[PDB]
Amino acid sequence: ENKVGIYKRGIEEHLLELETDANVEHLCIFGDYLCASTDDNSIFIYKKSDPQDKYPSEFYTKLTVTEIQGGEIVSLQHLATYLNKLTVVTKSNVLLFNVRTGKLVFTSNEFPDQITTAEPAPVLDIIALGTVTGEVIMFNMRKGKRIRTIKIPQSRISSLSFRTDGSSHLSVGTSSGDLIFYDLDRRSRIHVLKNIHRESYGGVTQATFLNGQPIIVTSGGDNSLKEYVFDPSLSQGSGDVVVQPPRYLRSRGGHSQPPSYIAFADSQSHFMLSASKDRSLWSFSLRKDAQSQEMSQRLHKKQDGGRVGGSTIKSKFPEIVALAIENARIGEWENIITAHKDEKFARTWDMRNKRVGRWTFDTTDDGFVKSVAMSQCGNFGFIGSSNGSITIYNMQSGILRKKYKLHKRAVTGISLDGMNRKMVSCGLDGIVGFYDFNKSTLLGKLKLDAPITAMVYHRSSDLFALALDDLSIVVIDAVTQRVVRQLWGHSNRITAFDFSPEGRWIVSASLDSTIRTWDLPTGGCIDGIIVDNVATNVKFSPNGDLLATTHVTGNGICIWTNRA
Amino acid sequence: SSLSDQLAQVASNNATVALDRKRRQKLHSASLIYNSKTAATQDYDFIFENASKALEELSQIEPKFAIFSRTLFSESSISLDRNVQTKEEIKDLDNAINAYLLLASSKWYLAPTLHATEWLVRRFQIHVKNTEMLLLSTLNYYQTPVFKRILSIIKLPPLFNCLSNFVRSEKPPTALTMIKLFNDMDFLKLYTSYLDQCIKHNATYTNQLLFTTCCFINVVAFNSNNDEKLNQLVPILLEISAKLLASKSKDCQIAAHTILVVFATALPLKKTIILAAMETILSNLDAKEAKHSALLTICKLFQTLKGQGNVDQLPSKIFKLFDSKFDTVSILTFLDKEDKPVCDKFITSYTRSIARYDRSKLNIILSLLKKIRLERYEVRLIITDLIYLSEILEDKSQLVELFEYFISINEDLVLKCLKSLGL
Amino acid sequence: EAAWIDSDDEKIKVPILVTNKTKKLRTSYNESKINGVHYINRLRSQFEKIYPRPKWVDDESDSNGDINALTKILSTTYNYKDTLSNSKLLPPKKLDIVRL
């Protein structure tokens, strides 16, 4: 905001607070000087105290750019072999400032466009200037004359880089998602990488050739950083004329949109599943941040013989609104069941291969899958539709077995005991229904007051909890079959909640931007956090140690730990 | 990687040095004329004797080989070993050999060229050290035993894998395989570089230029399906068409006309792109046969344009240059030709340009319309422009003659345009 | 020739033998301080030793119909097969159809 921090290895080794209230906009270091330009066109130059020291510390001077000298400051650069010169490029022209004395030395001829980027070229005196039309100006500074002018039409230029490998290439990354490579000797365009980052999230926001390598690191705004190579030429004598196009090399990424549903994927607290509104299911890693693939939505070839009917334009699935995972049969058949927004069936997924499975699971009464659950043994998947029906599919062969018609509204929660003995469902008619499962009978039918919007089952104590619509959490023992606790105190809708790994707390995040920790034995709220941003998922670790939540804005997952 | 892979790269680095008598026998055994036994028998004095004789003959036929008689065919060039000199002298030696191959590309049906390049092959090792220019220069001769010998000698590059199938066999490589070889894309980048160097050194000839325009036409025909592969074939072939048109030889200009007409009937191009191509054609159009070919291709480009603003007027400078290169008697002979190639859109744009710009040759307009059967929308546009020109310019008897001609033929369309504008 | 001159830059005088970079920059084994213009000239030559100088600045400077029109048009545009015709014609052999 108003300060400049000087970190080494992550730790703030010095702070540099500026003497204004206007925010800092640009920042360029060179030599002993640090030049920080706050947004009202005034550049603060700080100096090293001792010429042996490691970072600038003391105030030195406060240059300023009035309106009659230039517009808003676009960038602050330094060129090589310029003693005490700071190249300040504004929206109208290019300036050179002597920083020790504090005296302007030169003002270029005003460009008839608006300048958006600057970049010092690896030759002497030359700076490249990207405008808001399609123009890259190669501008000299010893003379002050536009050496070259290269036109990209119908685009805004966002990031410029040069090559220093021994070839004279240029990379112009646009604000539309494109990245175009020029050869400056033949005045040619080698190539154009189309749509590497999303146009909707800024486009290409930085592109950098590494210093002497044929490797360009391009980062976008869609939570992704890539880097590409220039493979050497396939010819012998020609060489620089037959240039191979740039191929892919490494990259990291995440979610672009905020995440919708999270889930802890094993008991070690090693892996998280995270499905998000850009229709992507990722498998993040809580141990090492380079173990986190994206689960692949690449279908399997049918076992009947027909052809799978879809679009020939491949796409992603609809967004995920429920997930169930069970590690009991992993690496033998599928163990995730996911329920997508406004579709009439669920998908199986496989966490071993990190791929989709070969079965999809229908509801058979024209109803959307409103909730899903899996057996403990890993054999059965229960699909509760939006018309009451419970269909029970075998997961090895993905074949239908049963159907339970107790509800006539939607079924917002299913669970099975750890002994495969009893089975609870809860639905929007305010009804909890306790079925047997080894027989096929009904054991009981409880009716509460409000509708029921969520159910969480703790199998080690056989207690489940239902988030209602008179704004309360009803804790029901499943064996003796009655309400044992009724936690009151939320003031708006209850978004998400979960049990403690031992059965002692319920943590519930709700739409009044709060997260409350209720104690089950004594019955009262023992902790409350207020968040700046509403929390949409809360999941305890299967181990005791972590809490993982995720909010309305933000593309990540907040991790908390246990003082307890 | 693996030890065999790194050693493979080491071997291909030291591929040409004769570290032992067996490698020496093999390397000196590969030859263009003599077989294995006699090629392993003879020596550099023998080869250079034949070289100096054949180069005297080649300089007598075409007088540009005297410089190679000064440098590449001297006794110091008997003595010097290529594998010992530094990279700078290697580069200059490669420039000398590339210039020689560009000159003696056009003479390969000749035992003199065979003997001179025998000396180059068996002293400076061109057939493994720089085979790219060797194959590109002698690529148009592709049925001939000289190309068979070149193939049996050369270790083939990365890009010539089809010929890597055809190497050391009995049948020649076939035209479909040459179409494959050109149908790769990096090959086309390489070959257009070769032709740009060839034009800049000003030594092209009719056989090679025929061959390369035929391969280019077949490449466009093979990729007629993919709109995307055609769209990335655009800059290469239209850049070589630009350089081929900037050339001075009528042969190069006709070959560029051929590439232009086939590529613009295979891809529906932009209006500005078509007009820029027409501008370069007319701006360098000099000879008479090239004039005939250029009129044919301009008519074809203006026809294959199909879209919005299809038939609008030729702009100012383009119309000026076009009339200066084709005054009216030439286009009238072209129109009363009896082959009758379809050119109605170009004619209509021509008359609209005359109506806006010149405002004199309206009897010429009448003769054009008498010789051509235009279409209905073209007649409507001509009539509308003439109505505007009659309302602005002072009325003239030639304009009265034009409207009398319309009323004779197709008066009700004139009534419709007057109903749109006027009484 | 230049377009600006810096008086303090001619005024200044810098050491050399206090750092290893500038120790590379020295010329004689007896010189130990060098004024500003000779300093920046040596730095400029050292920059040339690191990054060699290219043709695209060494020779090129951007300063009757011509023959460069086709190259200029190809250099400007990036999509050749036009889509903004909207001709009320129909394109052959490639059908634009959607399922409903």
């Binding site: 020790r100 | 790769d184 | 810098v14 970079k21 730095l43 690191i50």
Partner: peptide
Amino acid sequence: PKVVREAKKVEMTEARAYNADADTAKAA
């Protein structure tokens, strides 16, 4: 056989750069 287009392992060679902390100098 078509042309074998096949990518080989890349290896970051050493770099050489510049130092603005020599480019800037103090007064007399």
